[PDB]
DNA sequence: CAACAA
């Protein structure tokens, strides 16, 4: 099989990394238990695929209190514009991994893959967004290294919406930044390929 | 394939 993009990282984190989920997780299996902290990343996963789903509609007070997540957005969204992709597979032709990226568009004039995000702890930096980055730089890489799609692009974003209709953070990633994660992303592909043969 | 968690 060949591998994806959001498996590739998981795969292939830091031994610290792993330390402070699993420590997190069973602190949360500890106060909640085993049958409701499966409940809990049941419900956390099903907002992130709404939200997305929900805006999904909108490039084109709900009955659980997650509409803080668009609102969120909307100062975000007034800068999007010129939507050219959305939801799209991409290829890799040549260093052979697949991804699924959010959408594609213009955010301030400047075309870029949008990859959009929930979290119920706020992102004002970068770092805090984990390996968002290489998610990012990982999905523009395949869809420009790729049979089945007519432009390229430079830059990236990361937007992470809160549950609570705070003002959501953008994570510009100008075409710099980018060239420097993808490396970083380079490696992580082959630690991952490293570890199969 | 992804959602998110740190
Ligand atoms: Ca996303
Ligand atoms: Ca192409």
Redesign the pocket.
């Known amino acids: 099989?060949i591998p994806?993009?959001?498996?590739v990282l998981?795969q292939t984190?830091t031994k610290q990394?792993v330390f402070?989920?699993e420590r997190?997780?069973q602190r949360m299996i500890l106060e909640l238990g085993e049958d409701g902290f499966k409940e809990y990343?049941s419900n956390?996963?099903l907002?992130?695929?709404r939200?997305?789903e929900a805006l999904e509609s909108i490039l084109s007070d709900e009955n659980l209190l997650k509409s803080g997540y668009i609102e969120s957005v909307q100062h975000i969204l007034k800068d999007v514009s010129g939507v050219r992709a959305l939801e799209s597979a991409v290829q890799h032709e040549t260093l052979n991994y697949?991804?699924?990226?959010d959408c594609v568009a213009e955010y301030q004039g400047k075309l870029c893959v949008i990859?959009?995000?929930?979290?119920?702890?706020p992102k004002p930096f970068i770092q805090s967004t984990?390996?968002n980055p290489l998610?990012v730089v990982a999905?523009m890489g395949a869809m420009n290294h790729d049979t089945n799609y007519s432009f390229q692009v430079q830059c990236g974003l990361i937007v992470v919406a809160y549950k609570d209709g705070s003002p959501a953070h953008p994570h510009f990633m100008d075409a710099e930044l980018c060239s420097q994660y993808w490396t970083k992303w380079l490696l992580r592909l082959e630690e991952y390929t490293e570890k199969k043969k």
């Open positions: 099989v994806s993009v959001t498996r998981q984190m990394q402070l989920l997190w997780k990343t956390v996963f907002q992130g695929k939200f997305q697949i991804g699924l990226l990859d959009w995000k929930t979290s119920e702890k984990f390996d998610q999905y």
